[PDB]
Design a protein around this ligand. Structure first.
Ligand code: HEM
Ligand code: HEM
Ligand code: HEM
Ligand code: HEM
Lengths: 141, 146, 141, 146
């Protein structure tokens, strides 16, 4: 359960990303692929090397889904429902992996937004990514 | 855990720049703030009622410094983390009964702290080497469970 | 997300427990304490040995919470809200532990209800206990 | 992993009664049904569209029998699970990249299957000994990750 303070904190930190949204999304994916190599096997049709146009493009998509969740934070199950079906039904993404990407997203934010990544905001962002993950893993059948 | 020479180089170079009086306390405090069930083990540590209280708590800083001290020792003995962490394993597993998932969580919080402090210098390959290290330490600290 | 079939399956399996509800709840706790000894430290005021009146009494409480969740399966966040506050705020139960009790509850049901514990119903029960756990771990702050 | 003599006794006595042609397939099938993302690794196994299709799938039964075979080998070598599971670790970690959490899940599904089949004979202390065993096997199978 996200508190009012959490929602404010996430919106604010995300606010500072600006044009960099897709870039940071791509960076998070790259961090995940390098640190947790098991996650690479979901993308056999991507070249995952640094500077990859495919990873850059996908980063923007991931960022967009996260901003969708921020913008509709009180109705996330509905907002992410299609994405939830995709990751469970079609892609069969192991639920452990959401924790890995969530961590790499936090690391990317900490590396780019030092003033914003306070302990309180760190907690808020972690709860938010856990909520997003909970929704994205809610449709296994 | 197997770091390549380039990863050992990445790890030791960054570590030399770490403030050992501060970073451990920052990680432990953040653990207590971000994952509040962990406060269960620190009842005697005093005021943990707000994030500021936690981060400013002198006991949190002191024990954080002990944690970082154990990481520093782990870095010096990457090929024998198990022996290095044997007594700490008895402590955290046999005495305290801390679930070993929390060792993974503190490792990752430490990673976030290093990213926060070093910014762009904490590159994705540098992070990857540090993940190998914090997984190694978590696994060693959990040996008494295995 | 529990499907209509999951709800039917859980209600049906739970239906067969009958007077045994509290007994099976106590058995699940005993299985958890023996198999996962870290969980014992939450109950320093309980004697946890076999035949313990305290574990028997607590088993009935746990069973009652589960039947509350079955009976209000479409409104579980609300139904379990007080219990959620207790386990997070007061008790500080580590979220990993809910998976341990959930597993021991499945094992107890399998050991007592062989006709009902089909693979489909096993999946339904697992989703249900995961949903209960999600609610009980939703209030960390 | 350290089973006491009473726990080894509990484990080996029950295991002698297990149908090795059926129980492994029942566990693997249930893994695929209960935790459906695991079906990701069994694309070539054919029809997995319904629980009945999974449980009746002859390939699920055959590979389930291989899994149980590896558990039987683990039981014979409780003091060297790591060597016993070395090539299977290379397979599941290095080749297949299965997340090691799933080894824990299959272990627990096997536990539920043993409870289902043995009922009251699968007592809480017998379960506790089996949890030590399935944790031991999961940890060994994950060695290539550690
Ligand atoms: C915060 C968590 C996540 C978010 C917000 C997210 C978001 C997205 C989005 C927006 C898409 C494109 C969907 C479309 O085209 O309709 C996508 C596709 C995909 N995602 Fe994720 N994802 C997340 C976690 C993960 C994880 C953990 C994995 C696996 C490790 C994963 C694997 C994939 C794969 C394989 C695709 C298909 C890409 C392709 O084949 O072109 N996702 N995701
Ligand atoms: C990488 C993970 C960890 C490391 C390296 C670590 C290291 C240490 C060290 C060096 C000490 C001081 C021991 C002494 O006085 O000789 C300590 C004490 C302690 N640790 Fe940790 N720790 C870790 C994780 C955790 C976690 C996650 C918790 C709980 C959530 C925890 C709970 C405690 C407690 C309660 C003490 C005080 C023990 C006592 O004096 O009675 N530790 N730890
Ligand atoms: C399906 C999951 C669970 C359910 C339905 C459940 C249910 C309950 C209920 C109904 C109570 C009594 C509440 C009251 O008196 O108002 C309770 C108390 C308690 N629970 Fe749980 N619980 C669950 C999981 C856990 C886990 C995993 C743990 C720790 C390993 C735990 C530890 C406790 C403790 C320590 C108490 C206080 C008992 C006392 O001090 O008298 N619970 N729980
Ligand atoms: C206790 C855990 C496990 C044990 C003991 C085990 C054991 C085995 C054994 C004995 C084989 C046959 C190897 C051979 O042909 O020489 C095998 C194959 C295989 N296993 Fe597992 N397994 C376990 C868990 C898993 C899990 C959780 C997954 C995926 C979710 C998985 C995926 C596979 C696949 C895809 C193969 C076929 C490999 C190939 O022939 O290319 N295993 N396993």
């Amino acid at each position: 359960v996200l508190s009012p303070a959490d929602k404010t904190n996430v919106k604010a930190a995300w606010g500072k990303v600006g044009a960099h949204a897709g870039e940071y999304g791509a960076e998070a994916l790259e961090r995940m692929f390098l640190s947790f190599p098991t996650t690479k096997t979901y993308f056999p049709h991507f070249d995952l090397s640094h500077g990859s146009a495919q990873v850059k493009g996908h980063g923007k998509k991931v960022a967009d889904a996260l901003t969708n969740a921020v913008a509709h934070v009180d109705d996330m199950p509905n907002a992410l429902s299609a994405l939830s079906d995709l990751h469970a039904h079609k892609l069969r993404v192991d639920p452990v992996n959401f924790k890995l990407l969530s961590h790499c997203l936090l690391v990317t934010l900490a590396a780019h937004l030092p003033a914003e990544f306070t302990p309180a905001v760190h907690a808020s962002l972690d709860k938010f990514l856990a909520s997003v993950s909970t929704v994205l893993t809610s449709k296994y059948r | 855990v197997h770091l390549t020479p380039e990863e050992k180089s990445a790890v030791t170079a960054l570590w030399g720049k770490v403030n050992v009086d501060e970073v451990g306390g920052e990680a432990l405090g953040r653990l207590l703030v971000v994952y509040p069930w962990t406060q269960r083990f620190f009842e005697s540590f005093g005021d943990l009622s707000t994030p500021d209280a936690v981060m400013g708590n002198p006991k949190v800083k002191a024990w954080g410094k002990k944690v970082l001290g154990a990481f520093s020792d782990g870095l010096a003995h990457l090929d024998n983390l198990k022996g290095t962490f044997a007594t700490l394993s008895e402590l955290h597993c046999d005495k305290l009964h801390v679930d070993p998932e929390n060792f993974r969580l503190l490792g990752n919080v430490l990673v976030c702290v290093l990213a926060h402090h070093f910014g762009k210098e904490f590159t994705p390959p540098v992070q990857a080497a540090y993940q190998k290290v914090v997984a190694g330490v978590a696994n060693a600290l959990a040996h008494k469970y295995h």
